Coordinates of C-alpha atoms in Angstrom, one line a residue:
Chain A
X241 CA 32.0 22.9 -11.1
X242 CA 30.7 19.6 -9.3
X243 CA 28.8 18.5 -6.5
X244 CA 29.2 14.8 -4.7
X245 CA 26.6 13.6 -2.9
X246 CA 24.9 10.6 -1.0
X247 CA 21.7 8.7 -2.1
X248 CA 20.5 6.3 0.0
X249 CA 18.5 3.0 -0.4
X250 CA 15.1 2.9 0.8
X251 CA 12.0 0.1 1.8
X252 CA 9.3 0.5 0.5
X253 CA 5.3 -1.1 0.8
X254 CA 5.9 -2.0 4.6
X255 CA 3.6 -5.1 4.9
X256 CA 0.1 -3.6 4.3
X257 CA 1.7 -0.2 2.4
X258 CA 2.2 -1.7 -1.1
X259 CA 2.9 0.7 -3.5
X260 CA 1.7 3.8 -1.2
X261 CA 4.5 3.5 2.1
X262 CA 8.2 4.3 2.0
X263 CA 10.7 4.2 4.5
X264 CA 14.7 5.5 4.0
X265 CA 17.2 3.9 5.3
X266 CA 20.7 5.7 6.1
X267 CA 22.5 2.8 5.0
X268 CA 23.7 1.2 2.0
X269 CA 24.0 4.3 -0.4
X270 CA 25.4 5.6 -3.5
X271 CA 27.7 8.1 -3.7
X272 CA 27.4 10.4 -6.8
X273 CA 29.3 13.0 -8.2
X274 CA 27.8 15.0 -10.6
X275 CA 29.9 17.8 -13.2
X276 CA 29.6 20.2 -15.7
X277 CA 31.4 19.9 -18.4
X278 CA 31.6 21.9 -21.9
X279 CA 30.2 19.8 -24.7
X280 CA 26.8 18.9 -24.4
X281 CA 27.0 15.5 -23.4
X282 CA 26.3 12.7 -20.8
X283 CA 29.0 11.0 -19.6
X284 CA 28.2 7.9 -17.1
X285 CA 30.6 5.6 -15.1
X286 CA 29.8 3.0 -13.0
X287 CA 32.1 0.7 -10.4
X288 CA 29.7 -1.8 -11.2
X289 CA 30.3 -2.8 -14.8
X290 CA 27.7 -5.0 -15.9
X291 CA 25.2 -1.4 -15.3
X292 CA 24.9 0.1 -18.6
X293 CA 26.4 3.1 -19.3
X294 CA 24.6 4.6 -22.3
X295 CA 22.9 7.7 -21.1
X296 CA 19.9 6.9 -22.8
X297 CA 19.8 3.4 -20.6
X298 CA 21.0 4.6 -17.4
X299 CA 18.7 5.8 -15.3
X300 CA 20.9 8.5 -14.2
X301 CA 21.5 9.5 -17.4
X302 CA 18.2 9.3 -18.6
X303 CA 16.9 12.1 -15.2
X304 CA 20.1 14.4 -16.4
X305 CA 18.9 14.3 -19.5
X306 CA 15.1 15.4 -19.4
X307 CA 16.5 17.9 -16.6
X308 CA 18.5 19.7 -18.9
X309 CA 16.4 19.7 -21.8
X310 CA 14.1 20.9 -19.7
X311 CA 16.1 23.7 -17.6
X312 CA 17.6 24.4 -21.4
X313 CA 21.0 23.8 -19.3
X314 CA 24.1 24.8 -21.8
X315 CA 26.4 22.2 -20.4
X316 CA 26.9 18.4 -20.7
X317 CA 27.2 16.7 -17.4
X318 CA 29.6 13.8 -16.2
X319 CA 28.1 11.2 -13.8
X320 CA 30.2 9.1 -11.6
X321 CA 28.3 6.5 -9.3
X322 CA 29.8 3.9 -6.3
X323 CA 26.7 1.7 -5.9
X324 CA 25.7 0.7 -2.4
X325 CA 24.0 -2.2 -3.2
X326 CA 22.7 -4.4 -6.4
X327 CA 19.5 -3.9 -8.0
X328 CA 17.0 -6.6 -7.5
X329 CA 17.4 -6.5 -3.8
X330 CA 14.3 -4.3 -2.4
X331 CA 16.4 -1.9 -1.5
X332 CA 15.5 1.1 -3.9
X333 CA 18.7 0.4 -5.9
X334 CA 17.8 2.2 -8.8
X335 CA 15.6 4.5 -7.1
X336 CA 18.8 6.1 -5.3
X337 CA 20.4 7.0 -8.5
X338 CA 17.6 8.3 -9.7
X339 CA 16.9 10.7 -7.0
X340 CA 20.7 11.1 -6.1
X341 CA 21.0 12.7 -9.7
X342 CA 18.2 14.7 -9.6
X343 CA 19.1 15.8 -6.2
X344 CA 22.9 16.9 -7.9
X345 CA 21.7 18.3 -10.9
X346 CA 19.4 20.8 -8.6
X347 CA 22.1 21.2 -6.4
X348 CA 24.8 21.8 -9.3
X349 CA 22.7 24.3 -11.3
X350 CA 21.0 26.2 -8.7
X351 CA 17.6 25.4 -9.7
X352 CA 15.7 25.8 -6.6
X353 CA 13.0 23.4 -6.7
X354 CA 11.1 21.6 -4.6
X355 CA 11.5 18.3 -3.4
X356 CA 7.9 16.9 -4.8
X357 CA 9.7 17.8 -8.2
X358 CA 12.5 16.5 -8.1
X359 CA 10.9 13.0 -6.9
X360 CA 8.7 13.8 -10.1
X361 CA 11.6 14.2 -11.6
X362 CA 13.7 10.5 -10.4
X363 CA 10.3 9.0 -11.1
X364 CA 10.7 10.0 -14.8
X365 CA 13.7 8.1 -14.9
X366 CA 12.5 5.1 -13.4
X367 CA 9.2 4.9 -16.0
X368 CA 11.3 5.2 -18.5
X369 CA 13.7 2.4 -17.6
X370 CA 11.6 -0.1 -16.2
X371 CA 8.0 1.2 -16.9
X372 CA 6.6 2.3 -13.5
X373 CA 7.3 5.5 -11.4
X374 CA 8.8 3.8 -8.5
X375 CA 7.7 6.7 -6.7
X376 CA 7.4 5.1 -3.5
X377 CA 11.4 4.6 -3.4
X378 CA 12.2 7.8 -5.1
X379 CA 9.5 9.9 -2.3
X380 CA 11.2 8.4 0.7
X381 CA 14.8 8.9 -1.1
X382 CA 14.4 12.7 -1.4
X383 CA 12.5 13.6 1.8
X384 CA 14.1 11.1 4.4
X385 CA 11.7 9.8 7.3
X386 CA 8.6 7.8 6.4
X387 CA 6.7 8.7 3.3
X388 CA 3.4 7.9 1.2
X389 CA 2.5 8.2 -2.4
X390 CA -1.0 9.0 -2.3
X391 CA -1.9 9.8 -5.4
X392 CA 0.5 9.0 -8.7
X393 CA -0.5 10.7 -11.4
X394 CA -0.5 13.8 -10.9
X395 CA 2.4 12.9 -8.4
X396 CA 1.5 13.3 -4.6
X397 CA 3.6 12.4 -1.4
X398 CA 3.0 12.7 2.2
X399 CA 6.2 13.2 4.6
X400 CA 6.1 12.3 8.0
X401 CA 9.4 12.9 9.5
X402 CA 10.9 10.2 11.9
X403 CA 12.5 12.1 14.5
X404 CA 12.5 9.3 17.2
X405 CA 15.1 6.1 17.1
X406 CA 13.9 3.3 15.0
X407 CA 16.5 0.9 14.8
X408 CA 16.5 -1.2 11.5
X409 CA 18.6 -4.7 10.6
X410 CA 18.3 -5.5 7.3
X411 CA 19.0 -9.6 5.5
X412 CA 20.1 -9.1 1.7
X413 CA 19.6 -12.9 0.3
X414 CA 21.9 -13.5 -2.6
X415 CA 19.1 -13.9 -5.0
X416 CA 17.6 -11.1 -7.1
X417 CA 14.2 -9.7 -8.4
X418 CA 13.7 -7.7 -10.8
X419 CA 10.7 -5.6 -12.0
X420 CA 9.0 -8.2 -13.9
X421 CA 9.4 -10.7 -11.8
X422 CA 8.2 -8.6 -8.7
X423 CA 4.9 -8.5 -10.8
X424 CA 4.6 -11.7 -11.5
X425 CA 4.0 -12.7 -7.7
X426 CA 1.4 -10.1 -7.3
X427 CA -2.9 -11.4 -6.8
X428 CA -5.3 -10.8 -10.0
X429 CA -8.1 -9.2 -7.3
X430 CA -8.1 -8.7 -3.8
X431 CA -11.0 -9.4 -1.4
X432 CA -13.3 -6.5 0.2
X433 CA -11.9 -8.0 3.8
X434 CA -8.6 -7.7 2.8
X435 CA -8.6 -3.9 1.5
X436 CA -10.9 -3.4 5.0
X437 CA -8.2 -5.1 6.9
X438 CA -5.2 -3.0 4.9
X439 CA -6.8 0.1 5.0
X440 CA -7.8 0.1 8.8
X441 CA -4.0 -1.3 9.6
X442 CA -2.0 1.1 7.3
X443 CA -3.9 3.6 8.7
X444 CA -3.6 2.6 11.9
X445 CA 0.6 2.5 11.3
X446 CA -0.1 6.1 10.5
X447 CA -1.1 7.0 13.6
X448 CA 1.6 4.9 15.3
X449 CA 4.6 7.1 13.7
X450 CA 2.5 10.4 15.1
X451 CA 2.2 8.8 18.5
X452 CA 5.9 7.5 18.2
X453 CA 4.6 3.6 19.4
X454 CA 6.8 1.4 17.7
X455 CA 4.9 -2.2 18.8
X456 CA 1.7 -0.7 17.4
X457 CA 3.9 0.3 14.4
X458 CA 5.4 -3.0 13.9
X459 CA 2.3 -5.2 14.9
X460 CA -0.1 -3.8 12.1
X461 CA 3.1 -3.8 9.8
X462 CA 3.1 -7.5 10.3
X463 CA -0.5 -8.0 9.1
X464 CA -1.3 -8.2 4.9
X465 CA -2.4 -11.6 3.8
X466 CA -2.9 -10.0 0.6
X467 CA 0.8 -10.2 -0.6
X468 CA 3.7 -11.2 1.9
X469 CA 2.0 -14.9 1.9
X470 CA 2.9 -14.9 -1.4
X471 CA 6.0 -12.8 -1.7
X472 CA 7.4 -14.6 1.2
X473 CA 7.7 -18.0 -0.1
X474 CA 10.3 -16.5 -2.6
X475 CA 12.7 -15.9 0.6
X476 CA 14.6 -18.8 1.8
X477 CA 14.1 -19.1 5.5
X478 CA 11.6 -16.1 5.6
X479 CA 8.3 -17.4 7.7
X480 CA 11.1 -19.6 10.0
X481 CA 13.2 -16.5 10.6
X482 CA 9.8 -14.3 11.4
X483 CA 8.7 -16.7 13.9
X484 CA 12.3 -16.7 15.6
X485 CA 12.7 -13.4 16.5
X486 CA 8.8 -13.0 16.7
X487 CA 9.1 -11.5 20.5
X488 CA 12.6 -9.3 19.9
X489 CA 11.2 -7.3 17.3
X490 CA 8.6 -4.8 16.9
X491 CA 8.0 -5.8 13.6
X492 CA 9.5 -7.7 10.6
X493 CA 8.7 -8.0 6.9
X494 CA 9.8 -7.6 3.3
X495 CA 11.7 -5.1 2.3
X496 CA 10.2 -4.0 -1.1
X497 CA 9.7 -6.4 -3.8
X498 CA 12.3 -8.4 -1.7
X499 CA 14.2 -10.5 -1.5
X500 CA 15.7 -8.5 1.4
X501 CA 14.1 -8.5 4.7
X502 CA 14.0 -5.6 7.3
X503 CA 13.1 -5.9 10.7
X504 CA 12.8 -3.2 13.6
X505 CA 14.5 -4.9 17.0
X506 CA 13.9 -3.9 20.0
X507 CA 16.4 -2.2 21.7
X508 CA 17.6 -4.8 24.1
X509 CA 17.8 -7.6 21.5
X510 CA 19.6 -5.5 18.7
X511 CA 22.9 -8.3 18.5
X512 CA 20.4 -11.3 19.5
X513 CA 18.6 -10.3 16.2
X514 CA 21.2 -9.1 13.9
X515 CA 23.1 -12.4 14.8
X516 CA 20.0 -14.3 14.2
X517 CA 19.9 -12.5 10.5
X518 CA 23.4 -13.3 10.2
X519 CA 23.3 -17.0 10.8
X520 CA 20.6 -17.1 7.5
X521 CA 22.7 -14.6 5.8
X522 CA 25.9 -13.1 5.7
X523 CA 24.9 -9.8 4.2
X524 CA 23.1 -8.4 7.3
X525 CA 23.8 -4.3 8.0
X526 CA 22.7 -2.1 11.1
X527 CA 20.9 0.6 10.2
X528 CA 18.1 3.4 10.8
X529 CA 15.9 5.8 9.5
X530 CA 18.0 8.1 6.8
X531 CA 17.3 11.5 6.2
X532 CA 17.5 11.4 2.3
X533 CA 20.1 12.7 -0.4
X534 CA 22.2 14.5 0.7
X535 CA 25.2 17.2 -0.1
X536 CA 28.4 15.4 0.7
Chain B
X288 CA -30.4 6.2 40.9
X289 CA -31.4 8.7 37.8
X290 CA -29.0 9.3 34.6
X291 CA -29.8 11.8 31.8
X292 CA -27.7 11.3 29.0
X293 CA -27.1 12.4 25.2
X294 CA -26.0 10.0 22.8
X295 CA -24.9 11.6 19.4
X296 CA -25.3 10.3 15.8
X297 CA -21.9 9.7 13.7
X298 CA -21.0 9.0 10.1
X299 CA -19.6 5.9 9.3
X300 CA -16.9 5.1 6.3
X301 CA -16.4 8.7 4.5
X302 CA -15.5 7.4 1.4
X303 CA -12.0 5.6 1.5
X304 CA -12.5 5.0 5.0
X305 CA -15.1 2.7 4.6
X306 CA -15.6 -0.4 8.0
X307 CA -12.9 1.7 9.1
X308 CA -13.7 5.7 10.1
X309 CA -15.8 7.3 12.0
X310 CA -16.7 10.4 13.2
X311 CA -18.8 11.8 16.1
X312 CA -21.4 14.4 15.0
X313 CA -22.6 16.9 17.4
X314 CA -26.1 16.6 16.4
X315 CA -28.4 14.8 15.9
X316 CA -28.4 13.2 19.0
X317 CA -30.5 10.9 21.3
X318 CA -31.7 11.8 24.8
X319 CA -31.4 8.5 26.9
X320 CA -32.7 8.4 30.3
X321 CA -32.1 5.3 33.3
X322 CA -33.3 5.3 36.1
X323 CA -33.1 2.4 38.9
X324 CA -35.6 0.2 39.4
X325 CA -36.4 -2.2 42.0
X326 CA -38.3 -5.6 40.1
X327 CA -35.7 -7.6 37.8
X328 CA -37.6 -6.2 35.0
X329 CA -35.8 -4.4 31.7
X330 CA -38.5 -1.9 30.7
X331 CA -38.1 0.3 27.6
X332 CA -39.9 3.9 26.7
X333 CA -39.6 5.3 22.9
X334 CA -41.6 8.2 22.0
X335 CA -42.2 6.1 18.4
X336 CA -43.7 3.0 18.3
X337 CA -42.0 2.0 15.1
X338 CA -38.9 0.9 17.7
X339 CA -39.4 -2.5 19.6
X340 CA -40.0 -2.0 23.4
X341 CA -39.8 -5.2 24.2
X342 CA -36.4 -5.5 26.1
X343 CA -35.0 -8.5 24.0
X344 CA -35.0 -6.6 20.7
X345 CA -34.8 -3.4 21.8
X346 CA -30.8 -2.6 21.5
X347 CA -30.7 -0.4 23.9
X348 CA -32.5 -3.2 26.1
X349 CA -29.9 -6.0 25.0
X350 CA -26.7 -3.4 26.5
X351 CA -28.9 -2.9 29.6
X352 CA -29.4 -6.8 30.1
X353 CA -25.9 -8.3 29.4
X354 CA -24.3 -5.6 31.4
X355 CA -26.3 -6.7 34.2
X356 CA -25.9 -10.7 34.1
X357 CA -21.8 -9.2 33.8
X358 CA -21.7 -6.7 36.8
X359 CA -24.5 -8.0 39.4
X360 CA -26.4 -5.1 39.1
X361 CA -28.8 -4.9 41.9
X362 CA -31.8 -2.9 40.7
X363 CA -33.1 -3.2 37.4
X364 CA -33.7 -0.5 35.3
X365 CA -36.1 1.5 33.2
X366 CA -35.0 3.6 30.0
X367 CA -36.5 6.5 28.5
X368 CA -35.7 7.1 24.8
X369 CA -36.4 10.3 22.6
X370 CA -34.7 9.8 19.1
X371 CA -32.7 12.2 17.0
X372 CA -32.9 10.8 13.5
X373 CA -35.0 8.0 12.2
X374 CA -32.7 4.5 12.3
X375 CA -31.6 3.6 8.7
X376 CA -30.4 6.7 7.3
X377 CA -27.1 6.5 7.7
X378 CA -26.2 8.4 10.8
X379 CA -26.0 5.4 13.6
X380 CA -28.7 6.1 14.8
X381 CA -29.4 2.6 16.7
X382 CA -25.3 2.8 17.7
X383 CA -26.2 5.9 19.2
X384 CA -29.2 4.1 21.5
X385 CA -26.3 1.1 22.5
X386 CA -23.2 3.7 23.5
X387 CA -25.8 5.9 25.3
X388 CA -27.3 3.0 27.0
X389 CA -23.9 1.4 28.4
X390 CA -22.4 5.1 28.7
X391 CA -25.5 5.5 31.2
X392 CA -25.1 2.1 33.0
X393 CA -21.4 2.8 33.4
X394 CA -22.5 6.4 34.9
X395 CA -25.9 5.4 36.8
X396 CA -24.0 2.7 38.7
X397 CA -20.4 4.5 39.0
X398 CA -18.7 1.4 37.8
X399 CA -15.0 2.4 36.2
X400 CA -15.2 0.9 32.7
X401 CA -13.4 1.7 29.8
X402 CA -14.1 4.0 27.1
X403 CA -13.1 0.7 25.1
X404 CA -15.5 -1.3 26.8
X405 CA -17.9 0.5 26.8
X406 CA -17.7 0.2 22.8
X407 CA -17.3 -3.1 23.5
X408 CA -20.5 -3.6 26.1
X409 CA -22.6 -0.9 23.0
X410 CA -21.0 -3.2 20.3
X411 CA -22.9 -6.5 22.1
X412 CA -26.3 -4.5 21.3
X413 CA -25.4 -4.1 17.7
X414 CA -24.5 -7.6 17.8
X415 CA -26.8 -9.3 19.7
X416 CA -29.6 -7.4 17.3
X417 CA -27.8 -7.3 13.5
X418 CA -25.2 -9.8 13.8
X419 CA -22.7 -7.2 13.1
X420 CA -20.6 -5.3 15.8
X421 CA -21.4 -1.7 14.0
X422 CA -18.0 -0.8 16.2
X423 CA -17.6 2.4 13.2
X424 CA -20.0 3.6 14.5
X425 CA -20.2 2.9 18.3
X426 CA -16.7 3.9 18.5
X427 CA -16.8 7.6 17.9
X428 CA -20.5 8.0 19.7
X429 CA -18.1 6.8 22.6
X430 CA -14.9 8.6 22.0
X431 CA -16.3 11.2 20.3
X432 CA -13.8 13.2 17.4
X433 CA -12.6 10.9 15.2
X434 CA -12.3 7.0 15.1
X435 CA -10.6 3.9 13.1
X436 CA -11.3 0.7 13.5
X437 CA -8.4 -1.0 12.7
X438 CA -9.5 -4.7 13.8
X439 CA -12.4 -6.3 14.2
X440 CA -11.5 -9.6 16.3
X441 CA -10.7 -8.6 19.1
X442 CA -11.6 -5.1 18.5
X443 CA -8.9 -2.3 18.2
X444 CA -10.0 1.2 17.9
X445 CA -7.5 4.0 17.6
X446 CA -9.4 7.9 18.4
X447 CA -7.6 11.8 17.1
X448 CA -9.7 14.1 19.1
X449 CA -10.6 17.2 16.4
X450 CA -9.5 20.1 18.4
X451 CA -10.0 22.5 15.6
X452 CA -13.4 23.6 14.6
X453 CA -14.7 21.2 11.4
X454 CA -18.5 22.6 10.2
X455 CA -20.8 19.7 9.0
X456 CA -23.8 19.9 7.0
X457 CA -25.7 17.1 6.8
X458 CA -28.6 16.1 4.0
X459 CA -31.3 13.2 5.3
X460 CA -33.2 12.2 1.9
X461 CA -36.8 11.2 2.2
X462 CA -36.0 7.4 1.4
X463 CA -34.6 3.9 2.8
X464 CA -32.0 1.8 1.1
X465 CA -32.2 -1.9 2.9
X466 CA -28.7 -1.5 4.7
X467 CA -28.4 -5.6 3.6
X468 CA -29.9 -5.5 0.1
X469 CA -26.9 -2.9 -0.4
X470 CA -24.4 -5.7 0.5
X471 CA -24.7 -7.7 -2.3
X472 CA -24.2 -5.0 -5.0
X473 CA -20.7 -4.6 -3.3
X474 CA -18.3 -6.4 -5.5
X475 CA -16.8 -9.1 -3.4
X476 CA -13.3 -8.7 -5.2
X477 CA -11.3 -5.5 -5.8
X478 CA -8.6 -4.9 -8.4
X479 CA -5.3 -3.7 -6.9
X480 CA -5.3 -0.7 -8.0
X481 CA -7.9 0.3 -5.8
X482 CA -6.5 -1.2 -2.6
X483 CA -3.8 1.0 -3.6
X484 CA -5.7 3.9 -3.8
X485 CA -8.0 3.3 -1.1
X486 CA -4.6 2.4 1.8
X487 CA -3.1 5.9 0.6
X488 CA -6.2 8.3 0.0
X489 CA -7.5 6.4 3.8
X490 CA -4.0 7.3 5.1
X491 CA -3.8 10.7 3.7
X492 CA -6.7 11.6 5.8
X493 CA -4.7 10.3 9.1
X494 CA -2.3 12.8 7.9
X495 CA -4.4 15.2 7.0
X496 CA -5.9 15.5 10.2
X497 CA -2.9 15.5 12.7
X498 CA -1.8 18.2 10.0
X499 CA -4.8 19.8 10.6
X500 CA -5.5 20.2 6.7
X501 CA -9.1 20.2 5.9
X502 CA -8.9 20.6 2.3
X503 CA -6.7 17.7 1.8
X504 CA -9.1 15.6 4.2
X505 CA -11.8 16.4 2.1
X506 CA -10.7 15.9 -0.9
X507 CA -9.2 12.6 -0.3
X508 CA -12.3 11.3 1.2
X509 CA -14.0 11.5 -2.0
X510 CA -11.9 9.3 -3.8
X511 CA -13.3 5.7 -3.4
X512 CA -14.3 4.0 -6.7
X513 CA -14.9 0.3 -5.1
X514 CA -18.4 1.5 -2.7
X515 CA -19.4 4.7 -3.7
X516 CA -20.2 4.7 -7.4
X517 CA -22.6 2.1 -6.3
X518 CA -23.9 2.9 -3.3
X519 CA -23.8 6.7 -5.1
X520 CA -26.5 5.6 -7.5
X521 CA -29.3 4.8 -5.4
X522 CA -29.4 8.2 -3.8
X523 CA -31.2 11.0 -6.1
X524 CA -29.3 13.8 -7.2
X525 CA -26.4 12.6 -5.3
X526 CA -23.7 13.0 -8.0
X527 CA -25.1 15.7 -9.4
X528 CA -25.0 18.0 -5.8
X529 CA -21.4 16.5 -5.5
X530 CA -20.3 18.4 -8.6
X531 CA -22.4 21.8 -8.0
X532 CA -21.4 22.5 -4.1
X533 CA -17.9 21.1 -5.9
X534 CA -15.5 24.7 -4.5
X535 CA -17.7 25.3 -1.8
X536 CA -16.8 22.2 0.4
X537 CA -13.7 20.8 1.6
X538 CA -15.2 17.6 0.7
X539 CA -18.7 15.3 0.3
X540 CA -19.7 12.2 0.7
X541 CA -22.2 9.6 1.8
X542 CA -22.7 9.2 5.2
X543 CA -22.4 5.4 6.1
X544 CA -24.7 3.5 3.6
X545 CA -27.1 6.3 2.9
X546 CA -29.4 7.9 2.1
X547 CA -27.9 10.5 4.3
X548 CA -24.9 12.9 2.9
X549 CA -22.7 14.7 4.8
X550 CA -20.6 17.4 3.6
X551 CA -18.0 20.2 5.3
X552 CA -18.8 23.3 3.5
X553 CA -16.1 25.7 3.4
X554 CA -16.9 28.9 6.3
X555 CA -17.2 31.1 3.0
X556 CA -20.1 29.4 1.5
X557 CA -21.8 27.6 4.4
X558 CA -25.0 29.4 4.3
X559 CA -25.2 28.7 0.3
X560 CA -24.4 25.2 0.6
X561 CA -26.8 24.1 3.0
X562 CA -29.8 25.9 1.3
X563 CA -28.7 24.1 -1.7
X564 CA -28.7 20.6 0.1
X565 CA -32.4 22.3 1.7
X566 CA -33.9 22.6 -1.9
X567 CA -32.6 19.3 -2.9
X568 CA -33.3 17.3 -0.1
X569 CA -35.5 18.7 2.6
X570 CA -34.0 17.7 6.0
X571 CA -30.9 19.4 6.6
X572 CA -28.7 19.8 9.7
X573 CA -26.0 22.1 10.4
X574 CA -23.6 20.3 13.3
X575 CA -19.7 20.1 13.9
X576 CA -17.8 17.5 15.1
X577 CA -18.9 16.2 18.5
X578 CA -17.0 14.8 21.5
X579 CA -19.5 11.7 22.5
X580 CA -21.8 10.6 24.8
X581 CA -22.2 13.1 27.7
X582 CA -24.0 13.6 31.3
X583 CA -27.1 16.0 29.9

């Protein structure tokens, strides 16, 4: 009685989306198996040791948890979990475990619910741990394609699903950020222009994904002055490396809270790009658009 | 050398859109009339002498002349102008004198410019007479359905034609609010959780629309808190009809900076709503969404 399955990492706020936009990747990932056993207990285990493993601390744990409580589920529930990348990254690390195990335990009880649940669900996890819903990692985590929290308490997401190629390279820097410290970077107040200017351009990428245009996409991406001015200075290299792929890209910004950087190439400068990437850092991947946890 | 034209009135903002949407009303509307003359004269005809005939500060007169100076046109011309609403209400009305004007010129003289242009050439007027491009508003009179803004300098204006029926009630309160003097209450600064709010209630409505989802349009669109609980005040009863036609629209707000409300009443309780916007207010107008200024 188990179930195994793939959670991927995710990039969220895109530029002028803070907080609201999400985008899944289809690379890095976790794997996690999830499986009943007998006594009622939470058994985690991690191949990355310094993640803690008390139930009540792991965020995986913690999701299991209020799921079975919830369901009254009679069994206890071993967790096994390969990271695909480090938290602090941008990259939704957290946020994949979260969903994944939300995802399994569905999957491994037969539940039956609905995908807005079971991000409310991840996002429990994530409050709990590091005091914020994180929804707009867990969203894009359990539907796949392009996602936005538009309202976050009650819990609401839109899904726009990505059915067109979208290439994506992403730079992991070798430094970290955590929650706090994401926080910390972010203005007191923000001027009317500048909501005007988000608004109208977030919206505007909106209507990009529905009329598949990837420059328009990319181009408004590349437009807060709100945030990535300031978030950007935290990335060695970042501004230098914008401007020198500026025409080979239809876009490029932070991932997240960063420090990772994701950039959409164009299609006949995909190596030009990723070797660009490469040449500030090592820990460069090839990717696309994922299509969320899945049964593996 | 004789154009009869109809340029229609549009609301400006609704709600989280605000410097950003805009959509095209069927009625009311304008009836703009140009006819080639020979003299190099500009002359202007307004059924109310309340609006400036003199060619200079006459919007409609400022299109006419720059448009000229631009394309060499040979004759001059002479426009009639019957009103729909009364400027300053809310309902771009004076937009709706500049897009018919340059709509007309465009027509009267068969020259090929663009429906962007065109915007552009109408936005002049606004300009050359307010300061201020009022493009939210010029926009849709042009394109007609529905419009965003999504930047300013240069202007960028991205248009979802409303192929599904969308019925619009609109309430035209027996008062003026100084459109300026309603600038300063604004608060200059915004907390982030309201650009938050604002970028994914704005976008929702994108997605709403393509989805073809009235009830989530609606509701989204009235969930500013930076504009209108301020602007909301200064119009009587306001709030109050918000919360009594509450089930029977899909949503209401204020239509650009007032005093005017629009509202899309559910087809259910159409009838009911607008005699309750008829007892509060006195001017009401039943309409749906228009497609722009057209050959009459």
């Amino acid at each position: 009685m188990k179930v195994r399955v793939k959670a991927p990492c995710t990039s969220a706020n895109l530029g002028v989306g803070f907080d609201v936009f999400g985008l899944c990747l289809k690379e890095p990932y976790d794997v996690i198996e999830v499986e009943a056993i007998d006594d009622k207990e939470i058994i985690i285990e991690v191949d990355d040791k310094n993640i803690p493993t008390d139930p009540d601390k792991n965020v995986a744990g913690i999701v299991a948890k209020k799921m079975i409580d919830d369901f009254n589920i009679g069994k206890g529930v071993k967790i096994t979990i390969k990271k695909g990348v480090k938290a602090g990254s941008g990259l939704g690390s957290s946020a994949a475990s979260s969903a994944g195990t939300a995802y399994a335990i569905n999957e491994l009880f037969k539940l039956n619910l609905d995908k807005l649940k079971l991000v409310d669900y991840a996002s429990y996890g994530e409050l709990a741990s590091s005091g914020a819903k994180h929804a707009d990692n867990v969203a894009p985590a359990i539907f796949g394609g392009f996602t936005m929290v538009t309202n976050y308490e009650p819990l609401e997401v839109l899904h726009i699903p990505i059915d067109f190629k979208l290439d994506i390279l992403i730079a992991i820097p070798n430094i970290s950020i955590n929650t706090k410290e994401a926080r910390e970077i972010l203005p007191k107040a923000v001027g009317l222009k500048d909501l005007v200017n988000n608004v109208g351009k977030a919206c505007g990428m909106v209507y990009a994904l529905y009329n598949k245009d990837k420059s328009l996409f990319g181009r408004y991406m590349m437009s807060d002055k709100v945030i990535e001015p300031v978030r950007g200075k935290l990335i060695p290299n970042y501004f230098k490396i914008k401007e020198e792929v500026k025409d080979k890209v239809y876009g490029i910004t932070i991932s997240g809270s960063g420090p990772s950087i994701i950039a959409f190439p164009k299609e006949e400068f995909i190596d030009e790009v990723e070797n660009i990437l490469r040449d500030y850092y090592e820990n460069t991947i090839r990717t696309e658009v994922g299509k969320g946890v899945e049964v593996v």
